[PDB]
C-alpha positions as semicolon CSV with decimal commas, in nm:
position;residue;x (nm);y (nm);z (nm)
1;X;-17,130;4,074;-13,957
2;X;-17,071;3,924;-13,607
3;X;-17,259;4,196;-13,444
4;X;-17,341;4,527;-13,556
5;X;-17,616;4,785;-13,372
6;X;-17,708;5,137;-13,464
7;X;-17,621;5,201;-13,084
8;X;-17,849;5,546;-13,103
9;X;-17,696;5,842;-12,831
10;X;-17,850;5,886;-12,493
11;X;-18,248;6,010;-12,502
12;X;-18,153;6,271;-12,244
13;X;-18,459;6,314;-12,119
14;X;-18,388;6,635;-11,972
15;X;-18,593;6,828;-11,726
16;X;-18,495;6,863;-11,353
17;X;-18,753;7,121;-11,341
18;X;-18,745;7,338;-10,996
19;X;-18,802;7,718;-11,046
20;X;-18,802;7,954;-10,729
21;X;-19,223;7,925;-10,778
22;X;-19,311;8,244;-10,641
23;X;-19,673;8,365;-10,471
24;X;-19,914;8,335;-10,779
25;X;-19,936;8,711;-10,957
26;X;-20,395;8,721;-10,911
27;X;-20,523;8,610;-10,613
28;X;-20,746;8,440;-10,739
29;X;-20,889;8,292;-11,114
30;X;-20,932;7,957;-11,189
31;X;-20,592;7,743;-11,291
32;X;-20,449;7,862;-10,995
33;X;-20,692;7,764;-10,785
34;X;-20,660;7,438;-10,907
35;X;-20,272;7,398;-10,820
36;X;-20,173;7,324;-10,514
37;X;-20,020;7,648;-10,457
38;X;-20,340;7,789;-10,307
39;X;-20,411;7,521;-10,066
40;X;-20,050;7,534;-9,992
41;X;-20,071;7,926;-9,869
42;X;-20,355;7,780;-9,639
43;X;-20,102;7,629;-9,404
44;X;-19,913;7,936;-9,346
45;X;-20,252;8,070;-9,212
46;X;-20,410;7,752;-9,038
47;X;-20,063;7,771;-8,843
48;X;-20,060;8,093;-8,735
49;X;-20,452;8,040;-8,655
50;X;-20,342;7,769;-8,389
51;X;-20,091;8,009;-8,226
52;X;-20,282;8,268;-8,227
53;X;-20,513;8,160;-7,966
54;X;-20,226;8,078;-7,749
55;X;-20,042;8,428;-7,822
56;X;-20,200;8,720;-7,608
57;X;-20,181;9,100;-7,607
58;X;-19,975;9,193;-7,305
59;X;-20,097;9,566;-7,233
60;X;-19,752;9,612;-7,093
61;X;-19,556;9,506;-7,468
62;X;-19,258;9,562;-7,251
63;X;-19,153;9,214;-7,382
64;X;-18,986;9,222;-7,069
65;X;-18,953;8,871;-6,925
66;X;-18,899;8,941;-6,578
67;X;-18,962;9,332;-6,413
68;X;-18,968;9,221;-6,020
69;X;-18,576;9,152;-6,022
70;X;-18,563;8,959;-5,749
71;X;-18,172;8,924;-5,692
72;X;-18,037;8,534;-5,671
73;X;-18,128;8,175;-5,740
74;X;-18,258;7,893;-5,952
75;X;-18,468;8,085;-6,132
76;X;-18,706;7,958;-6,375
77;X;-18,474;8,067;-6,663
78;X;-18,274;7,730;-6,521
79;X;-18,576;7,513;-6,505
80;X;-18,682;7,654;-6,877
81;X;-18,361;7,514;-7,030
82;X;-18,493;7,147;-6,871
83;X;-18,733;7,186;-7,104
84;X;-18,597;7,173;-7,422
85;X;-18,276;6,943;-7,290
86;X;-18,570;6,713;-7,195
87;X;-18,658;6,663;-7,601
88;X;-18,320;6,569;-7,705
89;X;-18,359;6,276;-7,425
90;X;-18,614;6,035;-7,383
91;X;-18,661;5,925;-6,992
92;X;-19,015;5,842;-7,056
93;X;-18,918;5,506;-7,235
94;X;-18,696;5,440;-6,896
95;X;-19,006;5,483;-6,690
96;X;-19,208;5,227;-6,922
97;X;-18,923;4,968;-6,935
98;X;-18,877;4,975;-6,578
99;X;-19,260;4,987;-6,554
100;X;-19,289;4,626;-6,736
101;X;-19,038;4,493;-6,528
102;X;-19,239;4,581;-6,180
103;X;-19,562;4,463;-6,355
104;X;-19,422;4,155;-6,486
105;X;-19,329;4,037;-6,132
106;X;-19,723;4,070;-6,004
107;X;-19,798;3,836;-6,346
108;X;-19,568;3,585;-6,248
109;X;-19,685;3,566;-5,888
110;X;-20,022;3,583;-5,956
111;X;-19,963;3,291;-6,253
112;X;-19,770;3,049;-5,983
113;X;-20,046;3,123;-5,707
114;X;-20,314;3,070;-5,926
115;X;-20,136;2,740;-6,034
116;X;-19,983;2,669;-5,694
């Protein structure tokens, strides 16, 4: 024969694993702890843990932002939407570029006067 192969089917591995993995049924035992499932609820917590010095119990709970109500303005509700426009943009790499550029001159002058 000029050629001939058994040519078997695909192996099909098959898998593709990915279950919805939901919280772990003890607390705690021992193959559990092992996973990284346990570590993993640590995060949750550690998070929270670093907020939670920063978040205080207002006595008043009003939630309220603002209670004076002042009339007409700015306002720091304007100024508070800077904020978080300023993290789509990026003027701090302006302010370095530009930066170089001053600094660069003093180099050069100082490299020619030193060389005269």
């Amino acid at each position: 024969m000029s050629a001939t192969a058994a040519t078997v089917p695909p192996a099909a591995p098959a898998g593709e694993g990915g279950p919805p993995a939901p919280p772990p049924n003890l607390t705690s035992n021992r193959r559990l702890q092992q996973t990284q499932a346990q570590v993993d609820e640590v995060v949750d917590i550690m998070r929270v843990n670093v907020d939670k010095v920063l978040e205080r119990d207002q006595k008043l709970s009003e939630l309220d932002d603002r209670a004076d109500a002042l009339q007409a303005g700015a306002s720091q509700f304007e100024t508070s939407a800077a904020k978080l426009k300023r993290k789509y943009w990026w003027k701090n790499l302006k302010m370095m570029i530009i930066l170089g550029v001053i600094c660069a001159i003093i180099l050069i002058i100082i490299i020619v006067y030193f060389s005269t």
